[PDB]
Amino acid sequence: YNTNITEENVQNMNNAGDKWSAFLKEQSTLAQMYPLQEIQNLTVKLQLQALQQNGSSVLSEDKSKRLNTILNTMSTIYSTGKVCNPDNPQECLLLEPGLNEIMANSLDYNERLWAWESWRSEVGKQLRPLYEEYVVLKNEMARANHYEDYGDYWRGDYEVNGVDGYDYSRGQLIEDVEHTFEEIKPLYEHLHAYVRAKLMNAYPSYISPIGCLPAHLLGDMWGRFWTNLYSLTVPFGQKPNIDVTDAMVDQAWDAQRIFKEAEKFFVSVGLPNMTQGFWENSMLTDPGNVQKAVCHPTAWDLGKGDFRILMCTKVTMDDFLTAHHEMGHIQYDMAYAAQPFLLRNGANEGFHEAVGEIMSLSAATPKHLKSIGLLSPDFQEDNETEINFLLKQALTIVGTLPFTYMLEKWRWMVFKGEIPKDQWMKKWWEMKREIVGVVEPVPHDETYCDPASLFHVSNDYSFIRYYTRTLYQFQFQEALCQAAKHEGPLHKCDISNSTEAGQKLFNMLRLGKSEPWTLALENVVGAKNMNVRPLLNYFEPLFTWLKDQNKNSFVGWSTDWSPYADQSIKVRISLK
Amino acid sequence: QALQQNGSSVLSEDKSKRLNTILNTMSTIYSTGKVCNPDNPQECLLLE
Ligand SMILES: *[C@@H]1O[C@H](CO)[C@@H](O[C@@H]2O[C@H](CO)[C@@H](O)[C@H](O)[C@H]2NC(C)=O)[C@H](O)[C@H]1NC(C)=O
Ligand SMILES: *[C@@H]1O[C@H](CO)[C@@H](O[C@@H]2O[C@H](CO)[C@@H](O)[C@H](O)[C@H]2NC(C)=O)[C@H](O)[C@H]1NC(C)=O
Ligand SMILES: *[C@@H]1O[C@H](CO)[C@@H](O[C@@H]2O[C@H](CO)[C@@H](O)[C@H](O)[C@H]2NC(C)=O)[C@H](O)[C@H]1NC(C)=O
Ligand SMILES: *[C@@H]1O[C@H](CO)[C@@H](O[C@@H]2O[C@H](CO)[C@@H](O)[C@H](O)[C@H]2NC(C)=O)[C@H](O)[C@H]1NC(C)=O
Ligand SMILES: *[C@@H]1O[C@H](CO)[C@@H](O)[C@H](O)[C@H]1NC(C)=O
């Protein structure tokens, strides 16, 4: 279907998916009569547990169809929402095209404010009752499955039991998250202060030097990433960053050389060759013909000895990095190729994405570019280029940590009933002021529903995977080239001509889900929990640079200023 | 007589462009107006 869009392909989807789901349900019902606390062999007990879930079928039929209808309605309203200019209501814009481009390119305060306010006011108002009832349905469903709430069901992903002291209680996750965020707060404070100081020049008379930042100036709809502010926060614009886009042009690099170069890099690292069958039954480059196919990169796990990658080639570095990312996914896929079907997966949700990130990062270093030959040896990069690159990386990495933590904390606290239904939005914004340090431009009462505007929230998805993986990557960094005796800066780490790092990686790759992720961490990193020290060590030079640059500044913020307090009027009424 | 009509050009140039813009606006808004059901405000219907 991805290769060929036909109605026959769509009905083949429907039939195959229905058959697979029916087979899974019938197998679960047949195996449910096997008791659990009798098999001491863990590698089969894990399969029994992974096949034992009764899912939403415990819930009533009418309630089940109502829930499915509500989910479909939420997805449809998110996908087809539209707002537009009051001045000329005859032209209207969706969210994915234009509006995202507007918020990622526009420099007008009024335009950004209007778009940010209008999208929420015209989507969240519709979405509010649906979520208010969906949370109740999910809570009932979770309680029907011996869980405290749906948040407990989500947290059960990391839960490990009966492995003689390596167990991890579900409640322990919260403690780890808060302890990690405590050490992250000081660096985020400095970064936020520097960003506010830099934005003071772009939007004068709109930002208080000690207040929080207005929400509609973050470069994104919600602020999940701060990359779009790079042009407005460049430390040294006189010298450009590391760009080699003309290097492949000079050598006339077609859209085939990328994969061969990736294979050569893998061979130099120590990993074996690649399957010719994979080269044949794959989609290295988009045909470009009249047949539509999605250009979104994705690795496939067909099994049986064949894999493939779907991504539209192009002569640019990002394509090289994405190829490395997907190739890492594919390597991890063959890593558990000799495992049962129940074990043909990663240790948890944050394992597949952690491998591709480190793989791309190892090849993204300028040292690798110099070694390849594209970057001539005589050319050199000073400290300012490194600072610019580190700031660019930080604007993507650090920015999402407080946002992700705050979102997950809000969802967890709302799923356990600790927040009264009539006191959701207020509490939400309070966290935004005190965790993230962002203040809304206009007050929002309880009729709105702001987090429901995000795709992950309105589609029943867990957001914690973006947090822990972000840590694991950097932790993997300490396990990646420190064993490979790398002595230079951590941002210059590379593992070419290092077979020990490859062996250490393979030792955990060739495990699948057969062993707990804690066991893999102890096997490679040597710990039994996620650590934040590697991340702090990675950004030490930029941390020192910020500390030097923040002497004439006020690190931190006060959660009382607002862009509307200067023109507001207070009222006081005493009826009695 | 059929060729003698001085036409609407006798008006001032700014007034002429204002009239032309307004007529075009009327035509466009009539051609592209749309209303739809509050029950499902995601699908909306034209006139023709
Ligand atoms: C748990 O049971 C499985 C299922 O038999 C065992 O896995 C097999 O082990 C035998 C030898 O004991 C091998 O010949 C098979 O290749 C293994 N694969 C299968 C069939 O799953 C496993 O050994 C048992 N756990 C123990 C006893 O350590
Ligand atoms: C989910 O699976 C469990 C398996 O135990 C089912 O619970 C059993 O329900 C049957 C009757 O349906 C009883 O005879 C057993 O005593 C129950 N065992 C218990 C309490 O664990 C449960 O009904 C299943 N739900 C559905 C509809 O799939
Ligand atoms: C780091 O970047 C700065 C950019 O100027 C340079 O270091 C400073 O350079 C100016 C003029 O040369 C002088 O103040 C000093 O040589 C440096 N300032 C210090 C040490 O405080 C240099 O290009 C790079 N390397 C170092 C060690 O600063
Ligand atoms: C270690 O591995 C690298 C990875 O490429 C190899 O570098 C080769 O040899 C020289 C540089 O040393 C280059 O001109 C070749 O193009 C590289 N090709 C090969 C054979 O991979 C080499 O094996 C070692 N060199 C180092 C230390 O980088
Ligand atoms: C397989 O790898 C070996 C060792 O790097 C190499 O000599 C050989 O040319 C490779 N063959 C393929 C299929 O690339």
UniProtKB/Swiss-Prot annotation, chain A:
The active site is at E326, H456. Zn(2+) binds at H325, H329, E353. N-glycosylation on Asn-41 may limit SARS infectivity. Induction: Up-regulated in failing heart. Expression is induced by IFNA and IFNG. Exposure to cigarette smoke increases expression in lungs. Expression is decreased in nasal and bronchial epithelium of individuals with allergy after allergen challenge. IL13 stimulation decreases expression in nasal and bronchial epithelium. (Microbial infection) In airway epithelial cells, expression is increased upon influenza A virus infection. Changing T275A: No effect on interaction with SARS-CoV spike glycoprotein. Residues 33-35, 304-308 are annotated as: Interaction with SARS-CoV spike glycoprotein. Residues 1-558 form the Peptidase M2 domain. Chloride binds at R120, W428, K432. Changing F23Y: Increases slightly the interaction with RBD domain of SARS-CoV-2 spike protein. Changing R170D: No effect on interaction with SARS-CoV spike glycoprotein. Changing H296A: Complete loss of enzyme activity. Changing P340D: Increases very slightly the interaction with RBD domain of SARS-CoV-2 spike protein. Its cofactor is Zn(2+); chloride. Its EC number is 3.4.17.23, 3.4.17.-. One of its GO terms (molecular function) is metallocarboxypeptidase activity. It is found in: Cell membrane; Cytoplasm; Cell projection, Cilium; Apical cell membrane. Regulated by chloride and fluoride, but not bromide. Chloride increases angiotensin I and decreases angiotensin II cleavage. Inhibited by MLN-4760, cFP_Leu, and EDTA, but not by the ACE inhibitors lisinopril, captopril and enalaprilat. Highly potent and selective in vitro ACE2 inhibitors were identified. Glycans are attached at N4, N41, N54, N273, N383, N497. It is an enzyme of class 3 (hydrolase). Essential counter-regulatory carboxypeptidase of the renin-angiotensin hormone system that is a critical regulator of blood volume, systemic vascular resistance, and thus cardiovascular homeostasis. Converts angiotensin I to angiotensin 1-9, a nine-amino acid peptide with anti-hypertrophic effects in cardiomyocytes, and angiotensin II to angiotensin 1-7, which then acts as a beneficial vasodilator and anti-proliferation agent, counterbalancing the actions of the vasoconstrictor angiotensin II. (Microbial infection) Acts as a receptor for human coronaviruses SARS-CoV and SARS-CoV-2, as well as human coronavirus NL63/HCoV-NL63. Belongs to the peptidase M2 family. This is Angiotensin-converting enzyme 2. It comes from Homo sapiens (Human). The lineage of its organism: Eukaryota, Metazoa, Chordata, Craniata, Vertebrata. The gene is ACE2. The chain holds residues 50 to 625 of 805 of the full protein.
